[PDB]
Amino acid sequence: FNPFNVELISSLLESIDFSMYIEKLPHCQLVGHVKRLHPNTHLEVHNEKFEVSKMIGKGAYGSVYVGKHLKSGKKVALKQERPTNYWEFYICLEIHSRLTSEQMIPSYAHIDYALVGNNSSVYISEFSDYGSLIGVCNKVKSVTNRNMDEYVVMHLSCQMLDIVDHLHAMGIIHADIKPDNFLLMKPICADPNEVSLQLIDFGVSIDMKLFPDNQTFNYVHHDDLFKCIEMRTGRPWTYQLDLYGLVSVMHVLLFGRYMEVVQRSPSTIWMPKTNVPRYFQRTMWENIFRTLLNIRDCRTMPNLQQLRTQLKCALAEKEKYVAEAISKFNTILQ
Ligand SMILES: Nc1ncnc2c1ncn2[C@@H]1O[C@H](COP(=O)(O)OP(=O)(O)O)[C@@H](O)[C@H]1O
Ligand SMILES: [Mg+2]
Ligand SMILES: [Mg+2]
């Protein structure tokens, strides 16, 4: 079974009359034809006018632009895709309908306005001036000529675990967890519980509530970098795919490079090829990586809040240093 299959997705959306639903939403405008985003222009959704300012990313099938809602003055991202990405809108709508935690609402992208054409969609959401973890990590490294501080990465990992934990509680698999798809929305606070990250880009997410309970998947990514452990050993997967992605992000944050996994021969345990330095909190990181990468089956996922506890205990041992590191981090990014 392949949960990313384009015809499956069409079938799923039709089965729940998605089109009929979004036609009723006041922040969504259906139109015949959506123009290509272009710098220094204006865009309207109903009554609301937006400046379209500068390109952020641009591929053959879409782009992201920064712009501004003229009335409120708020900066926005404008995300355009061909063909129309209904599925991305569906996941975003479901996430915010299933949320009950006041704490977690800022940590998932919210589509404020949607312009939905026959050819193309444009989704508008809050713009982050700090950008993705990729941009933040590269900025910090270029200024310091060092890897991101170990304890700042603990603080960020604690946050990512919390966001993924609540997402999985809602029966959603993001399925594209990478540093590119976490935004830093605001500076870091000393309190590890304060969320400053936001998960974005639900383009290939999986909604488990659309499938029977006990449903699993066996589709295998082509690119080795993105194969989770189950995909490498001919086994079924569900939430494991996101947990694999979490490790890959932590790896990029800690080491400035992309994760390769290997069996730690002669055992069957999978771990990153990179060795955690002995003067890092090595036992802690190894526990975290091992627990997230090596999962018995789809019936029971590891306790993510236990991992957060391990990180908070390490952060608590050095509260003075941590406050200092976060301050330097925030100052770099001002
Ligand atoms: N709301 C936003 N604020 C700031 N930057 C953003 C925002 N949305 C997207 N970006 C930038 O654009 C990149 C691509 O956006 P994303 O929604 O992930 O598109 P794609 O589906 O093409 O990966 C992000 O990794 C980020 O660097
Ligand atoms: Mg993305
Ligand atoms: Mg995407």
Q: Which ligand places an atom closest to the C-alpha of 183?
A: 1
Q: What are the angstrom distances between the C-alpha of 251 and each of 8, 66, 154, 173, 198?
A: 33, 29, 11, 20, 19
What is the C-alpha to C-alpha distance for residues 5 and 8, in angstroms, rounded to an integer? 5
Q: How many CA atoms lie within 13 A of 41 on its CB side?
A: 10
Give residue 323 CA to ligand 1 midpoint distance, Å. 29
CA-135 nearest atom, ligand 1: 27
Give residue 283 CA to ligand 1 midpoint distance, Å. 34
Rg (CA), the chain: 21
Which of these, 237, 228, 25, lies nearest to 111 by C-alpha position? 25
10 Å CB burial of residue 18 (0-12, 13-18, 19+) is middle
If you take atom 5 of ligand 1, which residue's CA is the nearest one? 131
What is the C-alpha to C-alpha distance for residues 265 and 250, in angstroms, rounded to an integer? 23
Give the total residue count for the chain.
Answer: 334
What is the C-alpha to C-alpha distance for residues 330 and 316, in angstroms, rounded to an integer? 20
Question: Is 75 annotated to bind ligand?
Answer: no
Q: Do the Cβ atoms of 108 and 95 come closer than 8 Å?
A: yes
Q: How many CA atoms lie within 13 A of 276 on its CB side?
A: 19
Neighbours of 319 (CB within 10 A): 11
Q: Which ligand places an atom closest to the C-alpha of 64?
A: 1
Return the best residue to mutate from 87, 200, 204 for the ligand 1 pocket (most ligand atoms within 8 A of CB). 200
Which of these, 118, 58, 110, lies nearest to 88 by C-alpha position? 110
Residue entry with tokens 């982050």? 128
Q: What are the angstrom distances between the C-alpha of 245 and each of 131, 202, 239, 258, 284?
A: 19, 14, 10, 11, 18
CA-201 nearest atom, ligand 1: 17
Q: Do the Cβ atoms of 114 and 203 come closer than 8 Å?
A: no
Residue entry with tokens 């809108």? 89
Q: Give the bridge partners for 62, in sequence order.
A: 81
Q: By what method was this entry solved?
A: X-ray
Q: Which ligand places an atom closest to the C-alpha of 76?
A: 1
10 Å CB burial of residue 234 (0-12, 13-18, 19+) is exposed
Which of these, 326, 243, 250, lies nearest to 281 by C-alpha position? 250
Tell whether omega for the bond before 266 is within 30 degrees of 0, i.e. cis. Answer: yes
Q: Do the Cβ atoms of 126 and 110 come closer than 8 Å?
A: yes
List ligand 1's pocket residues with C-beta within 6 A.
56-57, 64, 77, 79, 125-128, 131-132, 180-181, 183, 200-201, 203
Give residue 202 CA to ligand 3 midpoint distance, Å. 6
Q: For residue 164, what are the contacts with CB-CB under 8 A and spacing of at least 6? A: 174, 177, 199, 242, 243, 246, 304
Q: For residue 8, what are the contacts with CB-CB under 8 A and spacing of at least 6? A: 2
Resolution (A): 2.0
Distance of CA 208 to the CA centre of its chain: 17
Q: What is the 3-state secondary structure (H, E, C) of the chain?
A: CCCCCHHHHHHHHHHCCHHHHHCCCCCEEECCCCCCCCCCEEEEECCEEEEEEEEEEECCCEEEEEEEECCCCCEEEEEEECCCCHHHHHHHHHHHHHCCCCCCHHHECCCCEEEECCCCEEEEEECCCCCEHHHHHHHHHHHHCCCCCHHHHHHHHHHHHHHHHHHHHCCEECCCCCHHHEEECCCCCCCCCCCCEEECCCCCCEEHHHCCCCCCECCCCCCHHHCCHHHHCCCCECCHHHHHHHHHHHHHHHHCCCCCEEECCCCCCEEECCCCCCCCCHHHHHHHHHHHHCCCCCCCCCCHHHHHHHHHHHHHHCHHHHHHHHHHHHHHCC
If you take atom 24 of ligand 1, which residue's CA is the nearest one? 180
What is the C-alpha to C-alpha distance for residues 105 and 310, in angstroms, rounded to an integer? 25
Which of these, 255, 167, 260, 152, lies nearest to 206 by C-alpha position? 167
What is the C-alpha to C-alpha distance for residues 75 and 50, in angstroms, rounded to an integer? 9
Neighbours of 287 (CB within 10 A): 14
Give residue 112 CA to ligand 2 midpoint distance, Å. 18
What is the C-alpha to C-alpha distance for residues 76 and 68, in angstroms, rounded to an integer? 5
Q: Give the bridge partners for 182, in sequence order.
A: 199
